[PDB]
């Protein structure tokens, strides 16, 4: 297994089959406790909780008295990232017999949604209890689960109420990617490509090479009794952990974290308009394409560089323009006026944007100051 | 202005009239921001918010842009220390124009209730924003506001959901004690006496001396224009800050030192679980100290003379020393506390023995932590 230290500690454990042969075991020995609370939605749970309850029983049998495994399932969707669901899980935990104590270890089994909710639930339960991250979406494995940022949503916006509570462990089991819907896998790929583009040319080239292969496995129908990523196993692990590693690196450090926002400046503006029909990664993809175009316009990025960005994103199934087909269909031709975008970008004179002087090489070691008029030029 | 440092840094500012001449000023200069949110109940607010709005305007006038002061008032009582109340305070914060942001400085103006709620609201607002403590109750000045422990209550218990969020500043304005109801003042005195009893025989001795005087000012009519603690001003500040200082000390100490802060609380908590909400926390802890002291004596660790002074000193301040005290009896229609019930409530605290803070003498703890004691030995003092 591959370990990626984060914040001066071992937190991340990444490899195939962790949820089957490792997690349970490791939790009982490194996260000693009498109460383990697994949280997940009905989609990912029905697929993975059974194998775990069993794997759990085997490890708990050897310990006495036997540690209990409590499970909580919530409806899928970001509808659970609410004040209501959090209170529930809390009252449910307090209603257990005996009530779940401060020794509780919470297991966040899911994506960004389950992740933020559970992480925040843990941070405040009796003023905080330990918890581990078990990212099931690609976007969660390389980004959302690394960092400790947790929160829920309110009818006035996303992530408005939450906390920064570092998970004790972060289990990255690449096998979760075997059942992850194709669209979701592609969505996460945006951040992976983003990470490379702001840190390593060689890594961005690896992504360029592997694209065809990865996408073949991600789409090919897999007959029961086989692994979706049969021969590409090592390639996938390398490309995905590279991103996770970077996120972990940045999180362990000032202006280095701003770079994690490349493509997000414009990206966020687009999403504010096209969500929830269009996904985060899908919007960031178009965001990277434009911010790259902005870098070119400002004379900081070369034409050749800009093309590969687009080419590489497309190669993975990500949208590169607001004019894309799918997007236009999924959003019945919604339109992002150059103004509404500049309005949104401000909801966050001049704008701060991450510019690239070349693939793998950031212009400044932080978000560069850019003038509005210069931004408005790449928004059409 | 006397300053006490907590957790390796200044935070506590203690003196008279801070709410009138200091707070506002200091907030604008040391807690620079565009949004300040004052939270309080309708009891303490109606008495103190007006003078503050004004004091605020004066300081904000010089600085430009103008730092806005938003105010939130909730019904008094621990009924506001709820998920709902917290949620409103937040939606209200997000609904302002423009919405309260991460630069926000929250002002917790009130007692333990307002303190815990606001402190917790702050800890999670956009994943955390700065906040200051402005303890208006005695119990809050020397205990609840020092430490960073925040939370709300749920129908299944107190302080079940919350967080540990250290306040940026802790303004201890002794003038709040001029309007604090007599009962509340006496309530807080329990913890002050507790602090002394576990750290300084001298400090305890002074408490015994200053009693008769303090209680005179607390229980007297103050004609218009006169400060309630006219001549005793320095005495009060000394006695009160001594406790606050200790709390600050323990809280900054890098284990069992925090256990000592639980003296009288072992039995004390058991009693409160039964007699609350009619009887207050301090009032229950008082009886708790009396009994735990009796337990120490029984176990041969505390002398008879020592135990007496404890009782005498608590009484001297108007605190109950036994469950048979008439004031209690009245407030609880004579509710009974079975030893069985008390021993059970003491177990709800996560066997054959209970851990209790024992004193070998006033100011001197037996062990540097909660000593292990057998059930039968505890049951004897309760009978
Ligand atoms: N490994 C997986 N296999 C199957 N379904 C999954 C997996 N991961 C999550 N899902 C489902 O996919 C959708 C997207 O997960 P979500 O947590 O919303 O994504 P993100 O982390 O991008 O916010 C949800 O409907 C969820 O139940
Ligand atoms: N400085 C003060 N003077 C007058 N009223 C106050 C003051 N402090 C708080 N109060 C009121 O006194 C009561 C006790 O405050 P609370 O915070 O509930 O107590 P504690 O801190 O002991 O838990 C409340 O009804 C409150 O509105
Ligand atoms: Cl909360
Ligand atoms: Zn992102
Ligand atoms: Zn107490």
Swiss-Prot record, chain A:
UniProt key word Nucleotide-binding: yes
Active site: 268
Recorded GO CC terms: cytoplasm
Single Gene Ontology BP annotation: aromatic amino acid family biosynthetic process
Binding site for NAD(+): 41-43, 78-81, 111-113, 116, 136-137, 158, 176-179, 187
Protein keywords: Amino-acid biosynthesis, Aromatic amino acid biosynthesis, ATP-binding, Cytoplasm, Kinase, Lyase, Metal-binding, Multifunctional enzyme, NADP, Nucleotide-binding, Oxidoreductase, Transferase, Zinc
Subcellular location as annotated: Cytoplasm
Binding locations of Zn(2+): 191, 264, 280
Name this polypeptide is given: Pentafunctional AROM polypeptide
Lineage: Eukaryota, Fungi, Dikarya, Ascomycota, Pezizomycotina
